[PDB]
Amino acid sequence: VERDEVAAQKRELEKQIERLSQPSGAEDSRMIALAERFGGVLLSEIYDD
Amino acid sequence: SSKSVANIIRKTIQREQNRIRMLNQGLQAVSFGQVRGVRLNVNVRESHAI
Numbered sequence: 001v002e003r004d005e006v007a008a009q010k011r012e013l014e015k016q017i018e019r020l021s022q023p024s025g026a027e028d029s030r031m032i033a034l035a036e037r038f039g040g041v042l043l044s045e046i047y048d049d
Numbered sequence: 050s051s052k053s054v055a056n057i058i059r060k061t062i063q064r065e066q067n068r069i070r071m072l073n074q075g076l077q078a079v080s081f082g083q084v085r086g087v088r089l090n091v092n093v094r095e096s097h098a099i
Contacts, residue, residue: 023056 024048066091 022028023035024045035042069091076087 022052 062093 019025019028023032024042026042026044031042069089073088078085079087
């Protein structure tokens with residue numbers, strides 16, 4: 001039980017880490033295709049710096 | 050990291066193509082002998098695109 005609880009916490013941590021990964025950490029699940037399919041740029045990336 | 054490398058290569062290629070296309074506009078309609086225009090053709094090699 002402790003191992004499974006720790007594993008759930010772990011999985012949440014890696015999911016959170018991944019969510020910030022690429023191309024610039026955002027809702028990249030579909031934001032990617034939604035972004036390159038149209039000649040636009042992510043606002044968060046625009047304000048990246 | 051590999052995905053990021055690929056994306057940055059693609060972005061740089063697009064930017065350079067845009068810049069070269071912009072520069073190309075100034076050489077339109079240059080009359081030299083039978084020559085009437087000059088272009089810098091930029092392309093992505095298939096052997097590297099794949």
